[PDB]
Enzyme design. Structure first.
Site, short mmCIF file in Angstrom:
data_model
loop_
_atom_site.label_atom_id
_atom_site.label_comp_id
_atom_site.label_asym_id
_atom_site.label_seq_id
_atom_site.Cartn_x
_atom_site.Cartn_y
_atom_site.Cartn_z
N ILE A 1 0.83 -1.21 0.00
CA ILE A 1 0.00 0.00 0.00
C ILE A 1 0.87 1.27 0.00
O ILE A 1 0.45 2.28 -0.56
CB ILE A 1 -1.03 -0.03 1.18
CG1 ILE A 1 -2.35 -0.62 0.70
CG2 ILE A 1 -1.26 1.39 1.82
CD1 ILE A 1 -3.37 -0.85 1.71
N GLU B 1 4.94 2.99 2.03
CA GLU B 1 5.84 2.98 3.17
C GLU B 1 5.66 4.24 4.00
O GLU B 1 6.48 5.16 3.94
CB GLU B 1 7.30 2.75 2.73
CG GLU B 1 8.27 2.50 3.86
CD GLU B 1 9.45 1.63 3.45
OE1 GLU B 1 10.12 1.98 2.45
OE2 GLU B 1 9.69 0.59 4.11
N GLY B 2 4.56 4.26 4.76
CA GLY B 2 4.20 5.36 5.64
C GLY B 2 5.09 5.46 6.87
O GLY B 2 4.66 5.13 7.98
N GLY C 1 6.67 3.08 9.20
CA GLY C 1 7.06 1.86 8.49
C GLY C 1 6.08 1.42 7.41
O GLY C 1 5.25 2.21 6.97
N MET C 2 6.18 0.16 6.97
CA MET C 2 5.49 -0.36 5.79
C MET C 2 4.02 -0.69 5.97
O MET C 2 3.65 -1.40 6.91
CB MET C 2 6.17 -1.64 5.29
CG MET C 2 5.52 -2.23 4.02
SD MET C 2 6.47 -3.57 3.26
CE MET C 2 8.07 -2.76 3.06
N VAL C 3 3.18 -0.24 5.03
CA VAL C 3 1.76 -0.53 5.05
C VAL C 3 1.44 -1.43 3.88
O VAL C 3 1.89 -1.17 2.77
CB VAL C 3 0.89 0.74 5.03
CG1 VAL C 3 -0.59 0.40 5.08
CG2 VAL C 3 1.28 1.67 6.18
N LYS D 1 -0.08 -2.24 9.13
CA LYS D 1 1.04 -1.35 9.29
C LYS D 1 2.14 -2.08 10.12
O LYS D 1 1.92 -2.36 11.30
CB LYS D 1 0.54 -0.11 10.03
CG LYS D 1 -0.80 0.42 9.42
CD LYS D 1 -1.55 1.43 10.29
CE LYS D 1 -0.91 2.79 10.29
NZ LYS D 1 -0.95 3.42 8.96
N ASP E 1 -2.06 16.73 14.74
CA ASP E 1 -1.58 16.59 13.38
C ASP E 1 -2.69 16.33 12.41
O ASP E 1 -2.60 15.54 11.48
CB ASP E 1 -0.47 15.55 13.28
CG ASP E 1 0.32 15.67 12.00
OD1 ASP E 1 0.39 16.77 11.44
OD2 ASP E 1 0.90 14.66 11.57
#
EC number: 2.7.11.24
Length: 337
Positions: free
Chosen positions: A21, A23-24, A25-27, A42, A137
């Site tokens: 999906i 790398e936001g 770590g990896m999604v 996630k 945020d």
């Protein structure tokens, strides 16, 4: 061990048929074999760092306590059975079609969609604020949407318990929120420990929904204030009197006078009630800024407003090695049995 781009993505047998999906770590998405739906997963690897541990723990704690239709839940948390073997944590959440960042980049929003999105943001925010939590945020990419436009607030990694009595600080020191959505006072004299920080961000989001362009696209930290004042115009005497800090106040007094850009000029196609609310959210003086409950009650949202269906939190909130244990303990409930 399930692999995705040559990285371990070890979500066990429950979650199969993975897709990258981002790398936001990896999604990744994955098929949930229990609930027989695809889900979002996630991978988080925070355990080397005080700050990653802190944000991960803080966020797990918040999302596990919160239960609200407009706040993303945690469905599951996957990790090794022992602290020793736990190198990563996987958080499983509802898979959402899109987010408001993505949507704004391509889709004109009807006024009905803007109204509905705003309602849902504020509804979720009422709950957050009622738990004495600041999200800190809020921005389009943290507003998730499914195919029927149900909206859920995510990413509480930067959240804090509200602390209005300790909010004051010096000039050009604070970095709270993502730049375009950061309230003017963050630059001037605020640590971002008051709920008004989130309302500003919502104001910015609302403006962005009206035009599909960020209202205050600062190129860098300092430029952000230039943008705000370019629209809001120079602060009033009364608002400047509210800033006791001399560096902040004298900076503002040093600026040439700037007049307000009328909202109906910036947003000629916007609903007038929307602009009235926008104005109230994007008030320079955070003490005068509308609060979440007032915003829900604003005429713009009258079609949706229903305080009895705008729930509040039952239980407001008041070194790395220990944080690993706390993360391990906080995630224990998801282990078999």
């Amino acid at each position: 061990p399930e692999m995705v781009r040559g990285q371990v993505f070890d979500v066990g047998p429950r979650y199969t048929n993975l897709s990258y999906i981002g790398e936001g770590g990896m999604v990744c998405s994955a098929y949930d074999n229990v609930n027989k739906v695809r889900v979002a997963i996630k991978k988080i690897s925070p355990f080397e760092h005080q700050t990653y541990c802190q944000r991960t723990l803080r966020e797990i704690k918040i999302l596990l306590r919160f239960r609200h239709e407009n706040i993303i839940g945690i469905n599951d948390i996957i990790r090794a059975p022992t602290i020793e073997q736990m190198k990563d944590v996987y958080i499983v959440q509802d898979l959402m079609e899109t987010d408001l960042y993505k949507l704004l980049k391509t889709q004109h929003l009807s006024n009905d969609h803007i109204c509905y999105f705003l309602y849902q943001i504020l509804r979720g925010l009422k709950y957050i604020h009622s738990a004495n939590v600041l999200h800190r945020d809020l921005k389009p990419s943290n507003l998730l949407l499914n195919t029927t436009c149900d909206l859920k607030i995510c990413d509480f990694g930067l959240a804090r318990v509200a602390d209005p009595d300790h909010d004051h600080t010096g000039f050009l020191t604070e970095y709270v929120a993502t730049r375009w959505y950061r309230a003017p006072e963050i630059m001037l004299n605020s640590k971002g420990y008051t709920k008004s920080i989130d309302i500003w961000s919502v104001g910015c989001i609302l403006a962005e929904m009206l035009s599909n362009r960020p209202i205050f696209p600062g190129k860098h930290y300092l430029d952000q204030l230039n943008h705000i004042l370019g629209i809001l115009g120079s602060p009033s005497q009364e608002d400047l009197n509210c800033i006791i800090n001399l560096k902040a106040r004298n900076y503002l007094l040093s600026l040439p006078h700037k007049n307000k850009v009328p909202w109906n000029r910036l947003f000629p196609n916007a609903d007038s009630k929307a602009l009235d609310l926008l104005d109230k959210m994007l008030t320079f003086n955070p003490h005068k800024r509308i609060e979440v409950e007032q915003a829900l009650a604003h005429p713009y949202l009258e079609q949706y407003y229903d305080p009895s269906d705008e729930p509040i939190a039952e239980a407001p909130f008041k070194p790395k090695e220990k944080l690993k244990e706390l993360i391990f303990e906080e995630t224990a409930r998801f282990q078999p049995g």
